[PDB]
Design a binder for this molecule. Structure first.
Ligand SMILES: [Mn+2]
Ligand SMILES: [Mn+2]
Length: 200
């Protein structure tokens, strides 16, 4: 279930499971998936199956990963890439665009058999500069990943949050990890807690 917002003249749906759906572009946006950052006690399969649920829920002609799809060199692993191959060939017609992050650079471009269009930040889909790193763009509003934004609630709970802002907006990390960059409670931006999508 989703929270619609207007942002720079576009209707964007913030998804409870840490994704943005862009209806006019029939596009699903996520960031910091970190396939291969799984521990052994959160799984690669669970992450891919989590994508399959969003892709079945919404008309997605394309998926755009704002950086950090595969974790590292131990994510170019025999078993692990096999599961991604499995997943990709179940969505043969989906276009998958990866904007390269510091982990995509480190590991290297995903193998060509997986049919992933690798591009360099910024990748501009008007009105938006899509980026991994949240650097301001010279002319466009930015949608970015990289920082793994969370918001701290006390009674502490680190919840993943969207940061919707005029110049640089942040998507929450799609991977399921501890930590995250604590977003200041005094920010002059719109915050949505991606457990519903909870505004502030
Ligand atoms: Mn990351
Ligand atoms: Mn990063």
């Amino acid at each position: 279930n989703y929270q619609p917002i207007e942002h720079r003249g576009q209707a964007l749906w913030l998804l409870a499971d840490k994704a943005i759906y862009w209806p006019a572009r029939r596009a699903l946006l996520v960031a910091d998936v970190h396939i291969g950052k799984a521990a052994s006690y959160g799984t690669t399969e669970a992450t891919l199956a989590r994508l399959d649920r969003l892709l079945a829920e919404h008309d997605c002609e394309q998926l755009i990963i704002l950086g950090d799809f595969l974790h590292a060199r131990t994510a170019r692993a025999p078993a692990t890439l096999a599961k991604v191959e499995d997943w990709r060939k179940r969505h043969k017609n989906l276009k998958v665009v990866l904007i390269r992050g510091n982990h995509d650079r480190n590991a290297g471009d995903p193998p060509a058999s997986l049919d992933i269009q690798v591009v360099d930040e910024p990748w501009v889909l008007e009105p938006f500069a899509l980026q991994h790193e949240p650097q301001p763009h010279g002319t466009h509003p930015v949608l970015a990943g990289h920082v793994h934004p969370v918001f701290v609630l006390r009674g502490r709970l680190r919840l993943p949050c969207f940061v919707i802002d005029e110049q640089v907006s942040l998507l929450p990390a799609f991977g399921e990890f501890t930590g995250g960059w604590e977003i200041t409670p005094a920010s002059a931006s719109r915050l949505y807690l991606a457990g519903r999508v909870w505004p502030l």
